[PDB]
Amino acid sequence: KEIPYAELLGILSAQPTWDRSNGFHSVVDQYPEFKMVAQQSAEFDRDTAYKVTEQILQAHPEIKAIWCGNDAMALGAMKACEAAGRTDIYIFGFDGAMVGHNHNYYGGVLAGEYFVKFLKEKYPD
Amino acid sequence: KEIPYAELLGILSAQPTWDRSNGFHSVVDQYPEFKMVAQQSAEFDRDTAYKVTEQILQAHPEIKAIWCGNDAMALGAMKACEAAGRTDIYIFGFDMVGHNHNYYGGVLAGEYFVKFLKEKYPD
């Protein structure tokens, strides 16, 4: 039933962080089977994402996926999963590159659609 | 030895959030005994802070203090601490090439946070 996941946020003071995450959540939050059990900044950085993911894996072992606000954080997350033997966890991300929406928000929307479609196929009810 | 704490940030897209937090950290980060174990927006909102703090207290029972980017969040955090029986936790709050008023308010709040907590928890 439930698909628990974690999210790695970018730098909290940087607008791309909010736009990517908000776009992602505009989609994923419509599918209540997806449960965000952890959400933390990894500062758009690979080494920080490794450290943060290592901690998330210990506190929330049930996660099936991690969505990341840039490629560097996804790479660090993937390394941490490998180091923990958690090669089962799926890693996703969007790297980019106010009234209305922009590039980072729409990219988060499309990334969220893919995240839902992929994970509902792997983990149907 | 160490003094773990949590920070409740304002609305992430609002510049006062960052001026206040950056001024606070310009002081606190110089003192290595203070360790920020959780940092999360509570949207400058009391009821959001209540819910966010309830979650932080369960993930990070080691915390001895919470610093908040406005009064509304401090009040929500205080209520959450009471609800969890954690009346031991101290709550604090305050309500770009140059520096501005919110930054200097954060600096003064951080100086007070350090002084107060170092008197409560001396080496």
Residue numbers in the entry:
A (entry chain B): 1 to 97, 115 to 142
B (entry chain A): 1 to 95, 115 to 142
Reproduce passages from the article:
Periplasmic binding proteins (PBPs) are a class of proteins that participate in the cellular transport of various ligands. The structurally symmetric bilobal architecture of their fold has long been thought to originate from a duplication and fusion event of an individual lobe. Here, the crystal structures of two permuted halves of a modern ribose-binding protein (RBP) from Thermotoga maritima are reported.
RBP-CPN was designed to consist only of the βA–Eα1–4 elements, which are directly linked to α9. In this case, the C-terminal α8 would not originate from the same chain of the asymmetric unit but from its corresponding symmetry mate. The central β-sheet as well as all α-helices appear to be well ordered, except for the loops close to the unresolved region and the termini. The r.m.s.d. of 0.5 Å over 135 Cα atoms of the resolved residues, however, indicates a high similarity between RBP-CPC and the corresponding elements of full-length RBP. However, it appears that RBP-CPC, which still contains this corresponding helix 8, does not reliably form a dimer.
